[PDB]
Amino acid sequence: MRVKTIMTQNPVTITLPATVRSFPVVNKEGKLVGIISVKRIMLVKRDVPVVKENDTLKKAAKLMLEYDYRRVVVVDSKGKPVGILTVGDIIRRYFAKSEKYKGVEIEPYYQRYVSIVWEGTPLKAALKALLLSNSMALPVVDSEGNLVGIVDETDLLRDSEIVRPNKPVAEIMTRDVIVATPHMTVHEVALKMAKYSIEQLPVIRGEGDLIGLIRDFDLLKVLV
Ligand SMILES: C[S@@+](CC[C@H](N)C(=O)[O-])C[C@H]1O[C@@H](n2cnc3c(N)ncnc32)[C@H](O)[C@@H]1O
């Protein structure tokens, strides 16, 4: 599979000078000069991964892994943006739809190292851990290390005190955790990521014995 099949075509761009998730940045001629993210409130990053629409998904995946960046801008011969390809696109439009990955377990790809947090941890400390995690979410465990929940940035909005403060993360965590196992296929993991709109599934054994984490980013390694 090629980039052209999985990318989102004709991305909205922003031409400099100037005052979704991010917008490709171009000059007067329309050539790509960087990308700007909404979170990053020059603020434009120049060293962004780029590919052509006829390149393989493998090439785009390699670049994402190389720059530890979640998207690549697709340009034409003129170096002008004609599409955008994100990790999300690869998961939802490719891994979750292709028949090729129904026969590939995630055992060789999931992370054995995972940042977690005890459910009794005050929110601020839990947020510090989230900030220092390579995952968008922190699996939550009880006092004995058993998996009991999971939490991410969006869960902060579950705190009624935002209507305008350092309680246990247990108060905003998601209790029903969608999990994976080492033998689960890339196909099924992607199906779950797409279905629940989540970027990671804790990897377990037994009923709640945490042994790893499979992130959408980890699935890119399958393409290599
Ligand atoms: C639907 S995801 C979307 C996150 C996306 N980055 C966003 O900003 O919209 C956010 C929710 O999924 C939950 N979540 C994350 N991973 C999960 C998992 N493995 N199992 C169950 N729920 C999960 C989080 O706790 C949170 O309530």
Resolution (A): 1.6
Which mutation among 20, 150, 189 tests ligand 1's pocket best, with the greatest number of atoms within 8 A of CB? 150
Task: Ligand 1, residue 176: give the atom nearest the CA.
Answer: 21
Task: Ligand 1, residue 139: give the atom nearest the CA.
Answer: 19
Residue closest by Cα to atom 25 of ligand 1? 151
Coil, strand, or helix at residue 200? strand
- Flag whether 200 is marked binding: yes
Question: Which residue ranges have their beta carbon within 6 Å of ligand 1?
Answer: 136-137, 150-152, 154-155, 174, 177-178, 197-198, 200-202
Half-sphere exposure of 1 (CA within 13 A, CB side): 22
Half-sphere exposure of 129 (CA within 13 A, CB side): 20
What are the boundaries of each domain within the chain?
Answer: 1-99, 100-224
Which secondary-structure segment (H or E) carries 80? none
The full length of the chain comes to 224
Coil, strand, or helix at residue 218? helix
CATH of segment(s) 100-224: 3.10.580.10
How far is residue 69's CA from residue 61's CA, in Å, rounded to a whole number? 10
What one-letter code names the amino acid at 217?
Answer: F
- Residue 103, judged by CB atoms within 10 A of its CB (0-12, 13-18, 19+), counts as exposed
Phi, psi torsion values for 86, nearest 5 degrees: -110, 170
Pick the CATH number of 1-99 from 3.40.1280.10, 3.40.50.1110, 3.10.580.10, 3.40.50.150: 3.10.580.10
